[PDB]
Amino acid sequence: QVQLQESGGGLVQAGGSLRLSCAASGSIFSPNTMGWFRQALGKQREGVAFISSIASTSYWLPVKGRFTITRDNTKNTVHLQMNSLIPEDTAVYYCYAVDKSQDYWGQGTQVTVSS
């Protein structure tokens, strides 16, 4: 079984900063391609960004500088840095591990920003 521990969300004022994070525990393999998915309220889900095992990054949005991904190879976890928040990014985040055989999903974190 695979468990994706997500943390770091909540209520933050506009222009604030925070640290989303998830740890992948259980039966993972070797390619281990990971990333994030955003779900707006009552809307479709889109891919935020993606990080592979070779430190290659692929952002699926014009969000460079805003979002930055850090890797923990020793424990193999993914951190995402929220800075300079705007209300347009108020959506729930689930990180995604497509991996090699069976892809998995997180349970959810509420990130909210309003003024």
Partner 1 sequence: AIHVSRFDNPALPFNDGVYFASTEKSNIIRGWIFGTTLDSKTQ
Partner 2 sequence: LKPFERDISTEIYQAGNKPCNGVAGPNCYSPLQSYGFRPTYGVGHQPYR
Site residues for partner 2 per CB under 8 A: 31, 33, 35, 44-45, 47, 50, 57-62, 64, 98, 100
Alpha carbons 94 and 78: distance in angstroms, whole number: 12
Q: How far is the CB of 61 from partner 2 (least distance, A)?
A: 6
Beta bridge partners of 19: 81
Residue 30 or 44 having the CB closest to partner 1: 30
Residue spans of alpha helices (H) in 6-73:
none
Burial of 6 (C-beta count, 10 Å sphere; 0-12/13-18/19+):
middle
**Encoded amino acid at 30, one letter:** S
Selection from partner 1, partner 2, none that 35 binds (CB < 5 to 8 A by kind) is: partner 2
Residue 52 or 112 having the CB closest to partner 2: 52
Tell which residue, 95, 93, 92, 86, has the closest CA to residue 114: 86
Selection from partner 1, partner 2, none that 33 binds (CB < 5 to 8 A by kind) is: partner 2
| Interface residues toward partner 1, by CB under 8 A | 30-31, 53-54
Residue 2 or 98 having the CB closest to partner 2: 98
